[PDB]
Write a protein that binds this ligand. Structure first.
Ligand code: FMN
Length: 168
C-alpha cells in the first residue's frame, strides 16, 4: 500500500531478500514490483519507495533495471522518500561491490528522491563501490554468496531503521 519495493533479479537472490524485507515491514505495507514487468511510471504510484538491485557483469545494473534507468529522467521523484538495498559479492567483485544501488541512487536523488536508510560499511571487505556517500553505504548491502548468515539480522535492523525514517 504505502511502500513500493522495486527490485530486479537475474538469479533470484535480490528477489528473496525483497520478500524478507516485505515480511519484516508487513505484507499490508509493502508491495513487490519486479522491474522486468514494470513501467517507469509505476514508480509514480508511491510516495515511499524501496529500490533493490544487484550488480552484474561488468559493474552494470541488473538488466531489467538497466532497461528502466534511461527512462528515469521521465519521472519526478520530488517529495518522495527512497531507500536502497542490493545483493552483491564483495569477495569476487571487491572493486565494484554494490555499484548498482549507487548508480540508481545518484540518478533518482538527482530527479528529486530523498535518500533514507544509509548503512554502515563496518562488516564488509571490499576495495570500491559506487554506493559510498561520505563513507556510508547508500542503503543496505547484502551478500548472499559470502555473508548469507548475516542477512537476517541486517534486514531486521535496517527495516526498524526504515520504519522510523519513513514514519510508520
Ligand atoms: C558474472 C557475475 C558478475 C557479477 N558482478 C558483480 C559486481 O560487479 N558487483 C557485485 O557486487 N557483485 C557481482 N556479482 C555477484 C551478484 O551480484 C550476486 O551474486 C547477486 O546476489 C545476484 O543477485 P540476483 O540473484 O538478484 O541477480 C556478479 C556475479 C556474477 C555471477
Amino acid at each position: 500500500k504505502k511502500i513500493g519495493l522495486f527490485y530486479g533479479t537475474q538469479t533470484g537472490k535480490t528477489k528473496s531478500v525483497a520478500e524478507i524485507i516485505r515480511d519484516e515491514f508487513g505484507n499490508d505495507v509493502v508491495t513487490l514490483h519486479d522491474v522486468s514487468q514494470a513501467e517507469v511510471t509505476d514508480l509514480n504510484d508511491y510516495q515511499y519507495l524501496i529500490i533493490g538491485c544487484p550488480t552484474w557483469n561488468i559493474g552494470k545494473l541488473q538488466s531489467d533495471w538497466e532497461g528502466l534507468y534511461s527512462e528515469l529522467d521521465d519521472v519526478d521523484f520530488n517529495g518522495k522518500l527512497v531507500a536502497y538495498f542490493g545483493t552483491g559479492d564483495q569477495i569476487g567483485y571487491a572493486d565494484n561491490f554494490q555499484d548498482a544501488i549507487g548508480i540508481l541512487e545518484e540518478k533518482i536523488s538527482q530527479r528529486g528522491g530523498k535518500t533514507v536508510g544509509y548503512w554502515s560499511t563496518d562488516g564488509y571487505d571490499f576495495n570500491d563501490s559506487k554506493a559510498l556517500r561520505n563513507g556510508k553505504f547508500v542503503g543496505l548491502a547484502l551478500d548472499e554468496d559470502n555473508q548469507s548468515d548475516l542477512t537476517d539480522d541486517r534486514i531486521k535492523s535496517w527495516v526498524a531503521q526504515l520504519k522510523s525514517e519513513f514514519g510508520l
